[PDB]
Structure formats: structure tokens, C-alpha cells
């Protein structure tokens, strides 16, 4: 009956393999079955109930690797189970799920910096590539707004980006929209009550505090409240009707702070922390686990 705010992988030193669930009603984090390789720089999501974690990067003493894994979590039986990888490894990735499939946008692979975009049918165990970006987006954010994908913002390899494009699924094609009013590489972004909304990132200046939410009605970028703590490579997603913000990077602390935005009062609060500050962590929220 419960959902939780499910936390996957991240960066401190070297890439991490938790999984642990927040419950934001009695404040727990619960311990879960590790990542089968430690990543940084993945997505998360669900479908049919499953947590997904997707792409990211293996930083490790003994070496470093991109990664092209899906991997599934089911919490009726806290284990992990490996998926159909995607076409190419994927760092610093953003992900939405439209009817079902998952859209696996962007990212790194070594000095690679990708536009191209591919998409996973669960039923099939089968990825398979779609149309690519007009622009290679790393740390991109992607949200899906009426079965629409939208990418915002990232890092193109010279040029850190305030511009956000569209994909059609119907057309097989990405068309531009009104661009962020500010420049944002790493933010988190996600859907809340028929809006875009990016949080926080980098500019190639500075980890930003600020908020802007896009309506599709007007086409049109508006700042909300500021967080409290300036972040870049944050968490983010959505539960029961607040964003929440997990973690991130300040240009000299990984962060465990967790923050929660009432869209009511328009205010963000800290509401928990996490047992380690990290950054780089996939996020998606579903049921609790099953213990009996
Ligand atoms: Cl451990
Ligand atoms: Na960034
Ligand atoms: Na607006």
C-alpha cells in the first residue's frame, strides 16, 4: 500500500552499489540488496511496479568504465535481475517512460558525447534506437509531460546548455521548445502537476540553488522557491504530490541533505539525510518491499 523513494547508486570517492528506500511518512531509510556493479552517474525509474537502473559508470581503484547495463529490482523479492543492455554505455544519463518503455536519452561514453536516443520494451527484453537529439546532452534531465519526452538542459562537451527539445514518438522526431532561463548541466528534473520542473545543476561557474518550472499551456519557463543547498548531480522525483531532492555535489561536499518542495506553498524543506552523502544516484519511487 506504501511507496517508498527508492535511492540507487551515486558517487563518494568511488562509485557506490546502495540501494536503500526512503519512507517519508515514520523517516526510515531501509537497506536493500546492493547494486550488482557499484555506479555512478545512472538513472532510475519504474514500470509495472519494477525499479530500473540504467546506464552510469563504474569509478573504481581499479579502473574506470562506462556502462550500457539495465538492471531490474523487484521489491516482492529485494533482488536484483539483469536486463538487455542498451547499444552503447551511457554516463551521466536521463531516462522517461512513455506507455510502458523506457527512453534512455544522452550521455557519455569516454570522450563520446551522445545525441543519440533508444528505447526498451520491458515485454520484449529488447532496446532498440529511435531518432536522436538535435544536440549531444550529457547530464541531461528528461521528464514526460502527455506521452511526450522532453530533454533539458546538459552538457554538450564545449558548451553547457539552457535549451530543452521534444520528442514525438508518433513522428519519430525531436523539435525545440522555449528555453530554460538559466544554463543547467546536471540538474534534476522531473513532472509534478502538468509541469516541467529543472532544479539546481551547474553552469560551468557555479552549483545552482535555483528552480524553474516549464508550462506546456504557455510554453513558457517560470522560477519557483529556491532550495535551500546549491546542487549539481542531484536526485530527484516525486511523491504523493512534492518533489524531493536527494543529495548532490556543492563544489566541495557530497551531499546527503534531502529536500522537499510543497508545490502548495511554494517553499522547499529539509526533511531527512541520507546515511552518506553522494552524488550521481538513480531515484524512482514504488511499493515498500515485501518482508513476510
Ligand atoms: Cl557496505
Ligand atoms: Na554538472
Ligand atoms: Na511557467
Request: aromatic content about 8%; charged content about 10%; hydrophobic content about 35%.
Given at each position: 500500500v506504501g511507496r517508498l523513494i527508492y535511492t540507487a547508486g551515486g558517487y563518494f570517492r568511488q562509485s557506490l552499489s546502495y540501494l536503500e528506500a526512503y519512507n517519508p511518512s515514520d523517516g526510515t531509510w531501509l537497506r536493500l540488496a546492493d547494486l550488482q556493479v557499484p555506479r555512478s552517474g545512472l538513472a532510475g525509474c519504474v514500470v509495472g511496479g519494477?525499479?530500473?537502473?540504467?546506464?552510469?559508470?563504474?569509478?573504481?581503484?581499479?579502473?574506470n568504465t562506462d556502462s550500457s547495463a539495465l538492471?531490474?529490482?523487484?521489491?516482492?523479492?529485494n533482488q536484483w535481475s539483469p536486463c538487455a543492455p542498451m547499444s552503447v554505455p551511457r554516463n551521466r544519463i536521463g531516462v522517461?517512460?512513455?506507455?510502458?518503455?523506457?527512453?534512455?536519452?544522452?550521455?557519455?561514453h569516454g570522450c563520446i558525447h551522445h545525441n543519440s536516443v533508444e528505447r526498451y520494451e520491458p515485454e520484449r527484453d529488447?532496446?532498440?534506437?529511435?531518432?536522436?537529439?538535435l544536440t549531444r546532452r550529457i547530464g541531461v534531465g528528461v521528464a514526460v509531460l502527455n506521452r511526450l519526452l522532453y530533454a533539458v538542459g546538459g552538457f554538450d562537451g564545449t558548451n553547457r546548455?539552457?535549451?530543452?527539445e521534444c520528442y514525438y514518438p508518433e513522428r519519430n522526431e525531436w523539435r525545440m521548445i522555449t528555453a530554460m532561463n538559466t544554463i543547467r548541466s546536471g540538474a534534476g528534473v522531473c513532472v509534478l502537476h502538468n509541469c516541467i520542473y529543472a532544479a539546481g545543476g551547474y553552469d560551468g561557474q557555479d552549483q545552482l540553488n535555483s528552480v524553474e518550472r516549464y508550462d506546456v499551456a504557455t510554453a513558457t519557463w517560470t522560477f519557483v522557491a529556491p532550495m535551500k543547498h546549491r546542487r549539481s548531480a542531484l536526485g530527484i522525483t516525486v511523491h504523493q504530490g512534492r518533489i524531493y531532492v536527494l543529495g548532490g555535489y556543492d563544489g566541495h561536499t557530497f551531499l546527503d541533505s534531502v529536500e522537499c518542495y510543497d508545490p502548495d506553498t511554494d517553499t522547499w524543506s529539509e526533511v531527512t539525510r541520507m546515511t552518506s552523502g553522494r552524488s550521481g544516484v538513480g531515484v524512482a519511487v514504488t511499493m515498500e518491499p515485501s518482508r513476510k
Open positions: 519494477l525499479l530500473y537502473a540504467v546506464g552510469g559508470r563504474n569509478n573504481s581503484p581499479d579502473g538492471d531490474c529490482y523487484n521489491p516482492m523479492t522517461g517512460v512513455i506507455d510502458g518503455h523506457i527512453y534512455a536519452v544522452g550521455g557519455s529488447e532496446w532498440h534506437l529511435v531518432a536522436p537529439m546548455l539552457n535549451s530543452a
